[PDB]
Amino acid sequence: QQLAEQAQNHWNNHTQVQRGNPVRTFKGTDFKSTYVEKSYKKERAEAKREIKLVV
């Protein structure tokens, strides 16, 4: 338990990542958003209305 809490303190002390020479690389693709909305009722309906307004 003391080494666990001291590892928390180790993070608080010198956790910041030293960038250089990756030991291994992981090729994934995520971590922001994977959303297309797929519900082209709104997007095309506003476009519809805007085109009617312009023309």
Partner 1 sequence: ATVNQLVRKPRARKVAKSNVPALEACPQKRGVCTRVYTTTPKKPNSALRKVCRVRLTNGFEVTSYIGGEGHNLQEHSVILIRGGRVKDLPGVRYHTVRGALDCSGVKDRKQARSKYGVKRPKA
Where along the sequence are the contacts to RNA (CB under 7 A)?
32-37, 41-43, 46, 49-50, 53-54
Q: Considering only 7-15, 16-24, 30-38, 44-52, which stretch makes contact with partner 1 by CB under 8 A?
A: 30-38
E strands, the chain, in order: none
The one among 17, 18, 19, 37 contacting partner 1 by CB under 8 A: 37
**3-class state of residue 28 by DSSP:** coil
Specify the residue, 23 or 36, whose C-beta has the smaller distance to RNA.
Answer: 36
Contacts of 37 (CB under 8 A, 6+ apart): 43
